[PDB]
Design a protein around this nucleic acid. Sequence first.
RNA 1: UAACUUUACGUUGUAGCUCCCUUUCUCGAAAGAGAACCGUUGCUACAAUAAGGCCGUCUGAAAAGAUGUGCCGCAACGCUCUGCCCCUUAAAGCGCUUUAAGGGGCAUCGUUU
Lengths: 130, 1033
Amino acid sequence: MNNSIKFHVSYDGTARALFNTKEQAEKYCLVEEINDEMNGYKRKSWEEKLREENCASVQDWVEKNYTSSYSDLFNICEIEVSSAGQLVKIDNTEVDDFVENCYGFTLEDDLEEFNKAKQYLQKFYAECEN
Amino acid sequence: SINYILGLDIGIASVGWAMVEIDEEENPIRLIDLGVRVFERAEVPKTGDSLAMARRLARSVRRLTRRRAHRLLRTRRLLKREGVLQAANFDENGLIKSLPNTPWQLRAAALDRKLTPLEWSAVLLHLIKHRGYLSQKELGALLKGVAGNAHALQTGDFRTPAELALNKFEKESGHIRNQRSDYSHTFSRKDLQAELILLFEKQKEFGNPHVSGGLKEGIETLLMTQRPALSGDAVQKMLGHCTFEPAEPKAAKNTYTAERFIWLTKLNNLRILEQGSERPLTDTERATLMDEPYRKSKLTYAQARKLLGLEDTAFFKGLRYGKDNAEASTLMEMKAYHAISRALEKEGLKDKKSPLNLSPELQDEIGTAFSLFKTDEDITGRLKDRIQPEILEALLKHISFDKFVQISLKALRRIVPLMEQGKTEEKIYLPPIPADEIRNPVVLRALSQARKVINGVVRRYGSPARIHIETAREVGKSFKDRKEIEKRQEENRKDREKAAAKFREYFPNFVGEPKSKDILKLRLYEQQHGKCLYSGKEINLGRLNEKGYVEIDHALPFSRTWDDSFNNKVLVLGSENQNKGNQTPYEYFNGKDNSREWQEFKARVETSRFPRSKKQRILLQKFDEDGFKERNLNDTRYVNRFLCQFVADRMRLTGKGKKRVFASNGQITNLLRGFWGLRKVRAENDRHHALDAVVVACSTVAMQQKITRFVRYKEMNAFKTHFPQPWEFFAQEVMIRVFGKPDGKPEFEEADTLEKLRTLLAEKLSSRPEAVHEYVTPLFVSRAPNRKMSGQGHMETVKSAKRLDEGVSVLRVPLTQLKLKDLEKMVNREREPKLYEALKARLEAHKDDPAKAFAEPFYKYDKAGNRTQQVKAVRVEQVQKTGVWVRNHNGIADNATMVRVDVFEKGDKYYLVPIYSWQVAKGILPDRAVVQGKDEEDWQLIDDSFNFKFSLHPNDLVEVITKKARMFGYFASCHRGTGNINIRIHDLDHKIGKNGILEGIGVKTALSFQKYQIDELGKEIRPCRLKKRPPVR
RNA sequence: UAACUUUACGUUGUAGCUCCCUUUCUCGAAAGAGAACCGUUGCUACAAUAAGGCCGUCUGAAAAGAUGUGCCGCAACGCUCUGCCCCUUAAAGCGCUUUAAGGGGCAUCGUUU
């Protein structure tokens, strides 16, 4: 059916990637963190971990030593969009209830404000969905 | 003022507790409190490293950079004061202006040329900056590169290493300096000193001034002066201290005395295990095999068996093998003795036949000299002035010793003569855990949190009459060990699933789900070779599934031995050998006089392929019943022994005065959990910790006795009788108090207030009025607060920030990571269109794999492309909303963590101000709230009109009463670009939110955003109000 | 284990030379060059390598200068010290404030250092 679930991994509110399942989305957070750690004083220690065990390359090493501790500030907000390009549900909350939850006002408050707020998300994720 | 017993469930990241009220005879009567205290693991979240080690590595890197900068600064000061460096040619920073950037060519041509003082300073500062490597896995590779370049200059026609460097590295490639991991470019410091002295000679020969001054010395003063290394004082301070003479430091295993001591202890803890008989080594055997570590090299267990006289089936105890005991292990070796012998063999002093003339005391001195000093120079210089020099270079050529032991030298040197022949104040509140005794971060953190829990309990209720700690099988293990345990659990699951598949295939007619008992029956019968182990008959496989024909029975009686092991069970029929009783297979099979039945019983339990440990345990019949029972009842790990001694010594316990701390074993706790009706769910919640803490706190000695007498009644016939429970409806009360929902029904709403929990208890447990007392409160898992205001200031990647007017943060990406998504965000994408389609072809050719597509070198091409240059890394624009300015405002980074998040009113709207660690270091307190979409420059500005309410830290309890629903838990994180908090439910219940967290909380319009405060016991829930904004610094 | 000595890599900045390649203007002339400017490949240098904070230290009237095998800064743990939150008791007043005492909790405080 049309509703397709995506995954917009963002760090410090800055969108970075866009995946199809949560597994790669959480794996991607590790790879970004490890490659960042390997840019300084922790690169010396991280070289053996990629070499002493047959897990060469950061991507392959994370693929098996995956941990849920993928550092903080990484946001994996899960939206789902049908084939029509219109957002329906976010995380576990419908788009009508999402704006009631994350933006804090119901549909009966101001309908035209959604065209300025709900429609605002559509173009916001229109640029994200590239 | 109430007698009670406290239990604990110490883990790596959670300490669940419980206090059980007991009567005058220490029989549990009620349950008066419980809870769980969750905390972060005291380990690096990735790879489980040591936090202190990582911080020390960072500090050492800082120290290295500081020392190199200071050394170069002193070099510049020398150049400014030794003759001249065109005084006042420096910038405002004191650096060198218009320094010639060709110092390798300067070292090459300085042999025959009159260097300009600017070029002379360039070459000199180059020499100090890249001053080589001194002797002082990865290191071996670096020494290989050092040795290779060392040999090139010795046998080559080039005097200075830099001359050969450029003159041949320019022929090989385009670079002269080291790159990534190409150690072909590294040099050596002694060769650099030789280069320096010959450079001074040449600059003197060609009449160059600024050479003969105090520089020529001061240059070596800067070049070779070095910070020294450790001494024995570090070994004393950072390790244990001898009781007899703490002043004495710790010996090293590379000494003869330590090797003899460890060998003798291994002998003292080794026995002979044959036909279920454990016998110690006899004196004649001990003398016979004592010569082995010196007569030969290694002591394999099979080698030890071959040397001595014993049966082939006789295995050895103490060899902690997980499985596959067929392969023999090695006992121990004379490391120092054999190392010295082989060094002397290789250096023309030994022939593997002559005895080692050096005395054992002399060997001890040599080992101490080699281990105390980490450099060759100090060892050779001092040696305590003991031994001849020829063997000194002989040893120093190959021998390198670095290790230590647990006992002081003298102490060992005095105990050995006596062993060769064969031989504070208690207070109300627990003191801090001694960091010296527990030298493990994770265990130290767990014990500190457990001590916090114990202190809270003592403060609230009083001194506990007894303590029933027991820790998980993961505490006291390295991170790799814990990963091995969880992995083995995973394959043990696969194996259980495959066994269930095997059982269903063998018996499709069997209905229901194969439990543990029947699957064990089938697997063991497969391992039992299709024969009962009482009468040796062939039993009906079809009748195996049904009840009555067969039943699992422990051969060793449970009442007197107290054994519950994975495979310490014998598949006996039943109704044919019901006369065993509690007699053990020694008098039921009549092994007193070696009766025939005994003989074929032993033969069928040893010839038939059964596990060796099962063959041994079934055939002991010669043990100490009480000692063995206490070995299978308690636990004697290092951590549990330390807890017992420390808690007994250093706090009040109003018990019976004999032993008021009871460390239990995991197997017995699991068994009693099974008997008392655990059922329900676990490992998806954080309250099974309190469940096991309640279970262990009811495992009093009286209860092990009620279990003992019940099992003794059950062994022989002696004829639903409930198994001994601590009180009526124990399971119902415990699972109402722990989880808040009845047994077997995890779908009901949790009774998370005192009123509804009390009503549920009264309605479901009306027959037991003692379930509702004044201390009945719903469990609230307490998370350890983290109010610290320090942490990484900014990610470790420095990104160019020239184009920070836009959002781009241009950075050099190596080609081995350039994806198709990184080609769109490339700088010279329209500027150099041909290379965009040149790189995109390689992305498409190897199917979006930069590692393989760009394994071969990529190259630019001219208009008529003719292989001009090579691309190794290319710039990649990346959007950069905000970041930290680093490297003296030359590059930008990314924010690391929010150390605090303040909140602000004025409009019934809670505006959140993120405070980062880099801001706390600079003393800057932000004045900008967060608004969705717009960047920081457009963020709301904070002034006196915004009321200040409180400040949020990670893992700090908060409550957002949004209109739709109320949400309670511990603040976790915030979406910086969206301004919504993340709330972790207290118990991390897996049926609420995303794996226990409530992401995307709408705080900007919440009815009331406030934070509470929780006691270390998880009680006293009340809001906390700040009066004024707290300063960052 | 402890801590160690390190050179070395990397990221960013600057400058030199060098790759392609923008408009640009100059030269002719239509794509090739000469000056620029702006990007940027590679190489060689120096600078920084957490954000930041302290000393020592010789001058001295100090803006500052002369100096050094210089020290601290991503952790754990703690409550002698200051501070936050929190109860408890007493004292007054005007629940609220003040004063005083006690017990904690947690760090921006303290020790390891």
